[PDB]
């Protein structure tokens, strides 16, 4: 079994023209591509080739005017950079910008073909800028095409319309993008851990509560799983895998497994204030490769301290590989707001799997 991995330099051609120490870096990726070559993981690995997407595929999921505003700013001036950034909700933009995004999709667009096609097993995607705050018609929260959706239509173009997909966001903010383009799809499971606070941390909206668990034909495939009251850890996350995560992916049967990798939820990062450990990353890890026959695309989203995003993808990647499963602490008992939020959440969607 042969794990894939993909890395473009170029990712970190995009950067912030206004603040050169905000936390969405190009270091980002090259840190932890450093930290792959290190620990001896990268060559390992089967190195997937970055590409381009294509306006068609980015068309998958979003409109012509977003898809044609974005791309403009490949020749604006700084004056112009400046003002369309401001049209956005938590965006910055470079003359760079968009071909980052491009590659960014389409290096998960290579990678998910490899998997689907059976040169490699499972695979992992170190890009930047992140997608999952992207919607159909606006970029949002440090995302211009939402990365993990365009790739769930993709493998669905590249196989068949009704390829059951599952999307686990475990990034410590809500995918707003990737609930709303599937909100209405069966053929999409998104399942998304957060930190919610009641609707006060970013992205703000009471979209992201339990009660959320989709529109139509896909009620019941939007399973928002959101914290509140404080830092969660390695043991809130692994009962949330236990009672919930796993149990309603086991009936979907995924055929393809996306994990909307941010690691902001570590330990260490600046942003998001829990303290999910590397360790805790491989264990949620290593339970979705039980899935799917092993088909799993690890997609970095968020996740800013340096060190901390760097170790813990690389235990990603050693459990995409085959390595065994480290040994995690002493996991401490529940909070009790995560014992509420399972509750919530298992009564939320006890009536769409009978598993639960
Ligand atoms: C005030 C509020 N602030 C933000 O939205 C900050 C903006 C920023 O960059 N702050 C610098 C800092 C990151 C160092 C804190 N963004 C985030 O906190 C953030 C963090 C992580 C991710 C992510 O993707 N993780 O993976 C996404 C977004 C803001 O702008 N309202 C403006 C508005 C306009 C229009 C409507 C509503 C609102
Ligand atoms: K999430
Ligand atoms: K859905
Ligand atoms: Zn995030």
């Not at 491009?102 to 073909?113: D, E, I, K, R, V």
Request: glycine residues 8%.
């Amino acid at each position: 079994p042969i794990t894939g991995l993909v890395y473009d330099q170029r990712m970190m051609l995009h950067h912030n023209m206004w603040d050169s120490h905000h936390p969405e870096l190009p270091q980002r990726i090259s840190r932890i591509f450093s930290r792959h070559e290190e620990l001896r993981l990268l060559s390992r690995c089967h190195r997937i080739p970055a590409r381009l997407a294509t306006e068609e595929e980015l068309a998958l999921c979003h409109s012509s005017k977003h898809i044609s505003i974005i791309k403009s700013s490949e020749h604006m001036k700084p004056r112009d950079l400046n003002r369309l950034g401001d049209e956005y909700n938590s965006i910055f933009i470079s003359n760079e910008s968009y071909t980052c995004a491009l590659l960014a999709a389409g290096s998960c667009f290579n990678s998910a073909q490899a998997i689907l096609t059976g040169q490699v097993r499972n695979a992992v995607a170190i890009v930047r800028p992140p997608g999952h705050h992207a919607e159909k018609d606006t970029a949002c929260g440090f995302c211009f095409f939402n990365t993990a959706a365009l790739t769930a239509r993709y493998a669905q173009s590249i196989t068949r319309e009704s390829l059951r997909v599952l999307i686990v966001d475990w990034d410590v903010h809500h995918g707003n993008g990737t609930q709303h383009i599937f909100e209405e799809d069966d053929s999409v499971l998104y399942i998304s851990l957060h930190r919610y606070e009641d609707g006060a941390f970013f992205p703000n909206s009471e979209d992201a509560n339990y009660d959320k668990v989709g529109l139509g034909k896909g009620r019941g495939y939007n399973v928002n799983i959101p914290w509140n009251g404080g830092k969660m850890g390695d043991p809130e996350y692994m009962a949330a895998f236990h009672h919930l995560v796993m149990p309603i992916a086991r009936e979907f049967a995924p055929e393809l497994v996306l994990v909307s990798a941010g690691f902001d939820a570590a330990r260490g990062d600046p942003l998001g204030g829990f303290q999910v450990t590397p360790e805790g990353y491989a264990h949620l890890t290593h339970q979705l490769m039980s899935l799917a026959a092993g088909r799993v695309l690890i997609i970095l989203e968020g996740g800013y301290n340096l060190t901390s995003i760097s170790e813990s993808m690389s235990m990603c990647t050693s459990m995409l590989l085959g390595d065994s499963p480290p040994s995690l602490d002493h996991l401490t008992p529940l909070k009790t707001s995560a014992t509420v939020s399972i509750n919530n959440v298992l009564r939320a969607h006890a009536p769409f799997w009978s598993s639960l």
